[PDB]
Tab-separated table of N, CA and C in Angstrom:
chain	number	residue	atom	x	y	z
A	1	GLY	N	-16.132	-28.397	23.505
A	1	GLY	CA	-15.580	-29.408	22.568
A	1	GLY	C	-16.604	-29.849	21.543
A	2	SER	N	-16.143	-30.230	20.357
A	2	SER	CA	-17.045	-30.672	19.298
A	2	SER	C	-16.440	-31.834	18.522
A	3	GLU	N	-17.209	-32.351	17.559
A	3	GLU	CA	-16.777	-33.459	16.706
A	3	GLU	C	-16.414	-34.696	17.520
A	4	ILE	N	-17.167	-34.942	18.582
A	4	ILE	CA	-16.909	-36.090	19.434
A	4	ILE	C	-18.184	-36.865	19.751
A	5	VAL	N	-19.001	-37.092	18.730
A	5	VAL	CA	-20.230	-37.845	18.914
A	5	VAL	C	-19.953	-39.337	18.736
A	6	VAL	N	-19.544	-39.980	19.819
A	6	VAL	CA	-19.209	-41.395	19.796
A	6	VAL	C	-20.475	-42.255	19.795
A	7	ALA	N	-20.696	-42.972	18.699
A	7	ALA	CA	-21.871	-43.828	18.565
A	7	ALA	C	-21.716	-45.114	19.363
A	8	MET	N	-22.593	-45.306	20.338
A	8	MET	CA	-22.557	-46.502	21.168
A	8	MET	C	-23.679	-47.460	20.793
A	9	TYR	N	-24.823	-46.914	20.403
A	9	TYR	CA	-25.962	-47.739	20.024
A	9	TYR	C	-26.018	-47.899	18.509
A	10	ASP	N	-26.727	-48.921	18.053
A	10	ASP	CA	-26.848	-49.197	16.626
A	10	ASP	C	-28.173	-48.681	16.081
A	11	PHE	N	-28.139	-48.146	14.868
A	11	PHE	CA	-29.333	-47.642	14.200
A	11	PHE	C	-29.203	-47.889	12.703
A	12	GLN	N	-30.330	-48.096	12.031
A	12	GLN	CA	-30.328	-48.375	10.599
A	12	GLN	C	-30.995	-47.262	9.797
A	13	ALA	N	-30.273	-46.740	8.816
A	13	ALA	CA	-30.811	-45.708	7.945
A	13	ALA	C	-31.302	-46.348	6.662
A	14	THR	N	-32.592	-46.243	6.413
A	14	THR	CA	-33.179	-46.828	5.220
A	14	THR	C	-33.638	-45.753	4.239
A	15	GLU	N	-33.675	-44.505	4.689
A	15	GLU	CA	-34.091	-43.411	3.822
A	15	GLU	C	-32.881	-42.661	3.266
A	16	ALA	N	-32.515	-41.552	3.912
A	16	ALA	CA	-31.375	-40.736	3.484
A	16	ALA	C	-31.184	-39.539	4.401
A	17	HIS	N	-32.297	-38.955	4.838
A	17	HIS	CA	-32.260	-37.792	5.721
A	17	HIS	C	-31.632	-38.168	7.058
A	18	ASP	N	-32.065	-39.297	7.602
A	18	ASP	CA	-31.552	-39.787	8.871
A	18	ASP	C	-30.340	-40.667	8.613
A	19	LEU	N	-29.319	-40.531	9.444
A	19	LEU	CA	-28.113	-41.328	9.293
A	19	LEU	C	-28.143	-42.499	10.267
A	20	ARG	N	-27.375	-43.536	9.981
A	20	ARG	CA	-27.359	-44.700	10.844
A	20	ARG	C	-26.359	-44.537	11.982
A	21	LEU	N	-26.449	-45.433	12.954
A	21	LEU	CA	-25.551	-45.421	14.103
A	21	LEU	C	-24.669	-46.659	14.080
A	22	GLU	N	-23.361	-46.453	14.003
A	22	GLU	CA	-22.414	-47.558	13.978
A	22	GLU	C	-21.652	-47.605	15.293
A	23	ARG	N	-21.865	-48.671	16.057
A	23	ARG	CA	-21.212	-48.833	17.351
A	23	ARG	C	-19.698	-48.905	17.195
A	24	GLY	N	-19.012	-47.875	17.668
A	24	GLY	CA	-17.567	-47.849	17.576
A	24	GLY	C	-17.050	-46.645	16.812
A	25	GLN	N	-17.821	-46.182	15.828
A	25	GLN	CA	-17.421	-45.032	15.023
A	25	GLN	C	-17.639	-43.717	15.761
A	26	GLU	N	-16.587	-42.918	15.835
A	26	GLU	CA	-16.671	-41.618	16.468
A	26	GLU	C	-17.083	-40.598	15.423
A	27	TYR	N	-18.330	-40.184	15.500
A	27	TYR	CA	-18.886	-39.250	14.541
A	27	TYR	C	-18.487	-37.814	14.822
A	28	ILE	N	-18.827	-36.960	13.871
A	28	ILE	CA	-18.544	-35.538	13.959
A	28	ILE	C	-19.850	-34.758	14.014
A	29	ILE	N	-20.147	-34.140	15.146
A	29	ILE	CA	-21.378	-33.392	15.281
A	29	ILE	C	-21.342	-32.118	14.433
A	30	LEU	N	-22.368	-31.954	13.613
A	30	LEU	CA	-22.477	-30.805	12.726
A	30	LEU	C	-23.539	-29.840	13.239
A	31	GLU	N	-24.747	-30.360	13.425
A	31	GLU	CA	-25.868	-29.559	13.906
A	31	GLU	C	-26.423	-30.146	15.201
A	32	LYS	N	-27.095	-29.316	15.995
A	32	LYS	CA	-27.650	-29.771	17.267
A	32	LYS	C	-29.161	-29.996	17.179
A	33	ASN	N	-29.942	-29.042	17.712
A	33	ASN	CA	-31.414	-29.115	17.735
A	33	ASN	C	-31.872	-30.045	18.860
A	34	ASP	N	-32.014	-29.476	20.068
A	34	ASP	CA	-32.419	-30.229	21.264
A	34	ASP	C	-31.373	-31.274	21.615
A	35	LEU	N	-31.724	-32.221	22.479
A	35	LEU	CA	-30.788	-33.269	22.887
A	35	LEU	C	-30.959	-34.558	22.089
A	36	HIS	N	-32.101	-34.710	21.439
A	36	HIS	CA	-32.398	-35.944	20.719
A	36	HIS	C	-31.844	-35.992	19.297
A	37	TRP	N	-32.602	-35.472	18.345
A	37	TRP	CA	-32.207	-35.528	16.941
A	37	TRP	C	-31.235	-34.432	16.517
A	38	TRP	N	-29.954	-34.792	16.488
A	38	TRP	CA	-28.895	-33.896	16.041
A	38	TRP	C	-28.567	-34.224	14.597
A	39	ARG	N	-27.538	-33.602	14.065
A	39	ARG	CA	-27.104	-33.892	12.712
A	39	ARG	C	-25.598	-34.039	12.731
A	40	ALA	N	-25.116	-35.255	12.545
A	40	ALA	CA	-23.684	-35.499	12.589
A	40	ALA	C	-23.176	-36.123	11.305
A	41	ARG	N	-21.865	-36.252	11.226
A	41	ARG	CA	-21.209	-36.823	10.071
A	41	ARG	C	-20.715	-38.224	10.397
A	42	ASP	N	-20.850	-39.123	9.435
A	42	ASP	CA	-20.428	-40.507	9.594
A	42	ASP	C	-18.916	-40.602	9.445
A	43	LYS	N	-18.467	-41.009	8.271
A	43	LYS	CA	-17.045	-41.125	8.009
A	43	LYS	C	-16.478	-39.839	7.407
A	44	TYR	N	-16.278	-39.829	6.096
A	44	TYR	CA	-15.730	-38.662	5.415
A	44	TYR	C	-16.636	-38.177	4.288
A	45	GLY	N	-17.867	-37.816	4.627
A	45	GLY	CA	-18.787	-37.331	3.616
A	45	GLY	C	-20.240	-37.563	3.966
A	46	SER	N	-20.549	-38.767	4.431
A	46	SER	CA	-21.919	-39.116	4.796
A	46	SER	C	-22.343	-38.376	6.063
A	47	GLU	N	-23.540	-37.806	6.049
A	47	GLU	CA	-24.063	-37.083	7.201
A	47	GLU	C	-25.574	-37.246	7.290
A	48	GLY	N	-26.188	-36.611	8.277
A	48	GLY	CA	-27.623	-36.721	8.426
A	48	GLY	C	-28.083	-36.668	9.865
A	49	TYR	N	-29.391	-36.832	10.052
A	49	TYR	CA	-29.995	-36.816	11.381
A	49	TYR	C	-29.509	-37.993	12.210
A	50	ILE	N	-28.894	-37.695	13.337
A	50	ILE	CA	-28.392	-38.729	14.217
A	50	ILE	C	-28.856	-38.491	15.638
A	51	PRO	N	-29.630	-39.425	16.207
A	51	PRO	CA	-30.100	-39.298	17.577
A	51	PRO	C	-28.943	-39.374	18.557
A	52	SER	N	-28.472	-38.220	19.003
A	52	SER	CA	-27.361	-38.161	19.944
A	52	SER	C	-27.679	-38.865	21.257
A	53	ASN	N	-28.926	-39.294	21.412
A	53	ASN	CA	-29.322	-40.042	22.591
A	53	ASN	C	-28.734	-41.454	22.494
A	54	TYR	N	-28.314	-41.808	21.280
A	54	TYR	CA	-27.675	-43.088	21.006
A	54	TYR	C	-26.155	-42.933	21.026
A	55	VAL	N	-25.682	-41.685	21.003
A	55	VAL	CA	-24.246	-41.418	21.021
A	55	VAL	C	-23.818	-40.914	22.398
A	56	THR	N	-22.526	-40.687	22.556
A	56	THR	CA	-21.960	-40.206	23.803
A	56	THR	C	-20.652	-39.480	23.511
A	57	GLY	N	-20.384	-38.395	24.221
A	57	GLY	CA	-19.147	-37.667	23.992
A	57	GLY	C	-17.996	-38.297	24.744
A	58	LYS	N	-17.287	-37.494	25.514
A	58	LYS	CA	-16.172	-37.986	26.313
A	58	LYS	C	-16.681	-38.584	27.628
A	59	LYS	N	-17.847	-39.250	27.556
A	59	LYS	CA	-18.504	-39.887	28.714
A	59	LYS	C	-18.371	-39.049	29.987
A	60	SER	N	-18.943	-37.839	29.951
A	60	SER	CA	-18.904	-36.924	31.087
A	60	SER	C	-17.448	-36.588	31.426
A	61	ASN	N	-17.088	-36.713	32.694
A	61	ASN	CA	-15.727	-36.446	33.135
A	61	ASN	C	-15.137	-37.702	33.749
A	62	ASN	N	-15.321	-38.818	33.055
A	62	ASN	CA	-14.820	-40.106	33.525
A	62	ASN	C	-13.309	-40.203	33.349
A	63	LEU	N	-12.832	-39.923	32.141
A	63	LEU	CA	-11.407	-40.015	31.845
A	63	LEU	C	-10.644	-38.727	32.169
A	64	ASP	N	-10.858	-38.155	33.353
A	64	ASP	CA	-10.119	-36.951	33.729
A	64	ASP	C	-8.666	-37.325	33.945
A	65	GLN	N	-8.459	-38.328	34.786
A	65	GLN	CA	-7.124	-38.831	35.067
A	65	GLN	C	-6.845	-40.048	34.189
A	66	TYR	N	-7.888	-40.477	33.466
A	66	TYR	CA	-7.844	-41.626	32.548
A	66	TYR	C	-7.806	-42.960	33.291
A	67	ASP	N	-6.805	-43.145	34.143
A	67	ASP	CA	-6.662	-44.377	34.907
A	67	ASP	C	-6.391	-44.069	36.375
């Protein structure tokens, strides 16, 4: 599965290369590169280096049965 980089932690982008982390926004993973600094998309255009260590996918296999 892809495009499921759910941002849980907050981060501030002051440059441009690195993207910020918005708690609640489900980002779209574009590039990987190890487990730390990935490259994802914000909304509909903005992208950049995003520490996936601050994001989370489908939280492992928690919602298998959902409830």
